[PDB]
Amino acid sequence: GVPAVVDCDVHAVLPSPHSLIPYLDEYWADQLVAQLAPTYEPNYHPRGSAIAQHSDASVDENGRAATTAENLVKDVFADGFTDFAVVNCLYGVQQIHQPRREMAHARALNHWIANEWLDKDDRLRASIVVPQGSPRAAAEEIDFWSGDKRFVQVLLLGQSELLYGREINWPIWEAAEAAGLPVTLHIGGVFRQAPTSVGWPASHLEWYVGQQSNIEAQLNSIISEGILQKFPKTKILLSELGFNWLPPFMWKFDKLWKSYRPDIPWVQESPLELIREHVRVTTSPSDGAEEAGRLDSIVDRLGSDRMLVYSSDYPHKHHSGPRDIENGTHSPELLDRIYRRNAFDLYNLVV
Amino acid sequence: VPAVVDCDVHAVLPSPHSLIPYLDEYWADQLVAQLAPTYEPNYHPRGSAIAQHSDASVDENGRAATTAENLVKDVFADGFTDFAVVNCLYGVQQIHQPRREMAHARALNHWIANEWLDKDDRLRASIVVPQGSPRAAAEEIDFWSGDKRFVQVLLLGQSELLYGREINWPIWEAAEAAGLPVTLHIGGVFRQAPTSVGWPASHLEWYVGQQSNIEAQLNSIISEGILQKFPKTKILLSELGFNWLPPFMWKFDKLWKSYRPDIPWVQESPLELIREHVRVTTSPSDGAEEAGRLDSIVDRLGSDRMLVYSSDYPHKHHSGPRDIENGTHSPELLDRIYRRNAFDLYNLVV
Amino acid sequence: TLPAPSVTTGIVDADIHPVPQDGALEPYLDDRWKKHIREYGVRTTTGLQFISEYPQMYGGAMRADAWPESGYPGSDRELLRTQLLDKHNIQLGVLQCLAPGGQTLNPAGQALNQELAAALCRATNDWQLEHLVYPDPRMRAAIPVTFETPDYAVAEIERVGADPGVVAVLGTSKTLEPLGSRKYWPIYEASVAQNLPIQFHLSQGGGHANTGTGWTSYHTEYHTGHVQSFQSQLLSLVLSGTFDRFPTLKVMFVEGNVAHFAPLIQRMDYTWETLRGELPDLQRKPSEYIRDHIWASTQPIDEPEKPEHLAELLEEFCGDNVVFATDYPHFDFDDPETAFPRSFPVDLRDKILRGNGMRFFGV
Amino acid sequence: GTLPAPSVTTGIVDADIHPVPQDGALEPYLDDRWKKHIREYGVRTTTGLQFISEYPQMYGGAMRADAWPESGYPGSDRELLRTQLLDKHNIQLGVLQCLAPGGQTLNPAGQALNQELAAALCRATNDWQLEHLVYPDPRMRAAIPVTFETPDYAVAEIERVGADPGVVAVLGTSKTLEPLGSRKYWPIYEASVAQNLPIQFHLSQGGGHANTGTGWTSYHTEYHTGHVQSFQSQLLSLVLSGTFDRFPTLKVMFVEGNVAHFAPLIQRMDYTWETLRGELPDLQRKPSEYIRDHIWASTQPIDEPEKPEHLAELLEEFCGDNVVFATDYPHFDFDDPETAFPRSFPVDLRDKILRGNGMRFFGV
Ligand SMILES: [Fe+3]
Ligand SMILES: [Fe+3]
Ligand SMILES: [Fe+3]
Ligand SMILES: [Fe+3]
Ligand SMILES: [Fe+3]
Ligand SMILES: [Fe+3]
Ligand SMILES: [Mg+2]
Ligand SMILES: [Mg+2]
Ligand SMILES: [Mg+2]
Ligand SMILES: [Mg+2]
Ligand SMILES: [Mg+2]
Ligand SMILES: [Mg+2]
Ligand SMILES: [Mg+2]
Ligand SMILES: [Mg+2]
């Protein structure tokens, strides 16, 4: 049994809200139609911008990539290198303020993934999309899918309404642990405050780059509030949020944990160790770590070769491509860990 | 015979050191080691004209309402008031550190129990709760539910999330189980701008404008279903005015008629739900004390059951606790305001 | 040269919502901004590509009977003329364009790229003057500008604000700072210089949650909640002394309701009687600013349980400062034939339908 | 006033020193109405708290336990500041950053919600620090707080005292209501450039938003580590907005935002821009190319990697010419110039951090 090559972040793109109708009860389906089916397509990867899709991705009748499992599977698995891919749908249910509709559309979205993606190719796995405006409802959604092992993780957005370590959000971590599932934070957000501590970014570019700051906040919250002692089997995947920012954050967090440990006395190990053991990160985008020697450098600065897991971020276009990380290292061993061994810790998938 | 209850008076914590006798060693020592930062709020700036009227007894630092002896002396002197409901606004809810918020809220309630309720059996009090953790807020309510001198739960007008959100349901559940009304009092956690259009630039602008947040809270509480889920719920609006209620009620009713299937559990009109479940203290009176204006506002509310007498001691308002009599010609209405309406909240007899 | 508006036998309608047909703004937008919109859309204070944070419920919140043969309600100028202007004898109908396309509420001024926002406001102003106002000058424009970038707003007021087809400057009820902030004073200065009053229309966005105490869940909360922003804005504009600095400035709150302003102002005075020492530079008692500076439009009309209370509250606000609007083509449109209670006084309604708006717009 | 330009000879630059006015020291410089206002209301800011900020300091006000004078708050005793800091470390250019009008750690005058009061407090602070500290001992020079959130008042204050040779920078806060590349702040940048003044932005609370982009923090580790986030966001806005295209001589320093994290932030910014630059087609340079001419960072509290060699690597990856020493006297995480750097740290880089780099920022 050899660990599989897992593409730890690819995307399904809902064509339109009408795709949810087969998986909605009459009350919600009729309502969606009567409301003229407003689309919660997010602005995290603006459909007309250069990040949205590779120019040569397979496309549907409207020119859009990744809206069908047939198209995604044709592209992702073509070259035979990838064994499994983890599908994250970013359709913006978490930005539905109406809490019953958030619950109903999140559920319908997961049904759409199950029936039109997971059922269509046994190499696909997926995150569970959850209604994070009600943490107890989010826990119920995790539980609803806990018997379908093709759902391999819980999806949370990088920007939340309250920090994920707050006790208000503990039901999510409890439910994920009870289901044996890692939790991923993926770039994106609920936008219930400014996306930064200094106000609203004026461009998509400024926003996208700067979401790394919110992930420092989330990790400090999760760790400081005690998630990793209260739910010690928790595993966290940072999807499509970079990773070169981690070491400077880790060093300062460690320095201040030494100064303030009595404020958080349950944290008895350095954040440095907790992050290396409980946090993994996807490799697309690589944010310059694909340049000569820089992947060896960042692994040295992380202090662990166990954290980086391969992804393509299909269909998104980044400055360097899925396998260009090979240019950043001289170690075949490190590449073997990134391509297959590190993700075994998350999903236990074998070739 | 229902008692004359002063439904909002204030205890003012002298300083955080007053909490030391009621904190575990870990928190008492940490307090002294922090140089005891005070969470005294700016809701009633101590040096401003609202903080205390010139007739109020004061302590060695010139502050009113920092001792039960001073408060009881002033509040009960004239024989009209039978009981008074004490709210301490010390800003534990603005403590971000969640365990400290819990510890200081619990200590504050102990201080109220020992240095106020134990000193005079005419005093009652609200339960201060750590609203940053609704689970822990529910436990604080449960803990004090045994002491029937605690007669309501204290929540601030501005919260972190709206009080009707499911995240907050444990508070409403615990208050209902304890048989306690929930009061919203002017004040806030200040975890966003106090208005939907940014930060007020003065205390005066802030103070006047907090009525807008109470419209938000009432709509959230009702629309989200609190009054069907917890049908014994009673809500007291303390020191938030009341003349703004009718225009809010009418628009809410009008839009409930338009959006009924969005909130199908709300089967009675918001008009009736507010008249039945919401009560409001009379200080400040915000102009309803002028000739005929109290009869008018009762006509506009559609109910004579909502207003409950308070003095808001020790605060100074433009008109005094009993000046409301100048706004009505009805002794029956004054009987409702001074005693009968608060019987629905506290069931206190003379 | 366009004649001045003339209101004789007909009425003022202070809030009408036209929408450009698809592509209608393109002749008025530089190619760079065309490209930007194609590639990014109009990003604002959401994480959503196409919709705002509270999308409309049934039918786009439009009148079911206001859909043209093709396009969105408000996008067909002939249907606007027959269903609104002719049907209600509107002789001054003030256009408030809330979206650059076939949508209900997505204001150009709220685009987070404020250079784009300025270009869309400019394009909207050229478009509404050429397509709607000049062909039928019963209509006149309230010009959207970028309140959050005063330099650009001032430039646009200088560019087109003197055009006789323009009767007001158009802002949004939600802003990043309360409207009495010095940030917005250059816009007030430029508006006064062009003899223009300002209308602030109900909006989402602004940069903060839609209440001062969290984001709303259900549509009752969202829609009733619109009143709150206007309460906050009135308090800031008055207490800041903005009208001491600009003693000729007129502002109208549009679609904030009316009656609630009366008890709010009453509380403002009563609180100020005690706390006035915080703001010793304010020249007048707070309620005294209303008569000369604050107007409000009527839609959606307040509906008290006892109808007599409407006239009472409108007068407690200021009976001379209340102005009729229909809100065509939104679902809660008010018909001037039926909006007022049976017992309402003719003189007050007449002022609301005619004189009051004529005074505000300088007609 | 008339004062020689600063001379850095064999001594060092200290980019962040926190003096505090003794009780009453600002009153000679305030109108009666503001003295009355402060007595009656205090200084209201973005909190619901009369006397403290939303995150009050954890241990002894976050001051080193040996910097307490006979009577006042640390930093309130000029003689003690001379012997404990300027004399002790041969500081020849020590830049004052007054963060509070009184003995109450971290409460910036510019953040008073009454911006007329804020302006008056900034002006009083500027008159006071020049009279009480700079002119008596011109080893010290002022970074003048101004009201960033009311540019008209800031421009007026920069015009009033900005040309005084006792002033070497304009002082802002890390947190603001809009990101610092916003056109709101451009009049301040214009006025600063006209006086040939760089701008320092010091770590702050407040600003109008939560202290992260995704909620308010709970524990002190989150709060203190979280301060870097605001600086990350400000760097992105200042660069990507083209602020430095509009003001090509403008120099900005992030004070007490740490240093090393800027390197991978900038690296991710370039990498993202390579794909998405079409959104912002006017920007004249690749984003990282703005750093050398426009962005500085002070060292305190020094980054402490697990392998010390990574420090110099990350400082050079940011920009080795643009890192400037600071002590943060008298705060508890004070850095000593003799011990702040790892034993193996390159001597040439250390020398320019202590001297040349700050001289170039401050125009010496
Ligand atoms: Fe991704
Ligand atoms: Fe009170
Ligand atoms: Fe409208
Ligand atoms: Fe409308
Ligand atoms: Fe400092
Ligand atoms: Fe410091
Ligand atoms: Mg089905
Ligand atoms: Mg390719
Ligand atoms: Mg260690
Ligand atoms: Mg008696
Ligand atoms: Mg004109
Ligand atoms: Mg003034
Ligand atoms: Mg005066
Ligand atoms: Mg100079």
Residue numbers in the entry:
A (entry chain G): 28 to 378
B (entry chain C): 29 to 378
C (entry chain D): 11 to 373
D (entry chain H): 10 to 373
Reported in the publication:
We expressed AibH1H2 in E. coli grown in M9 minimal medium supplemented with excess FeII, and subsequent purification furnished protein samples (FeAibH1H2) containing ∼3 equiv of Fe per AibH1H2 heterodimer and minimal heterometal content (entry 1). Fe occupancy in both the mononuclear (Site 0) and dinuclear (Sites 1 and 2) metal sites was evident by inspection of the anomalous dispersion maps obtained from X-ray diffraction experiments performed on single crystals of FeAibH1H2. AibH1H2 had no detectable activity upon the exclusive incorporation of iron ions. Initial assays to determine the enzymatic activity were performed by mixing FeAibH1H2 with the AIB substrate and sodium ascorbate as a sacrificial reductant under aerobic conditions. Subsequent workup and gas chromatography–mass spectrometry (GC-MS) analyses of these solutions revealed minimal d-MeSer production. Since the protein structures of these two samples were found to be identical (RMSD = 0.34 Å over all atoms), our findings suggested an apparent requirement for one or more Mn ions in AibH1H2.
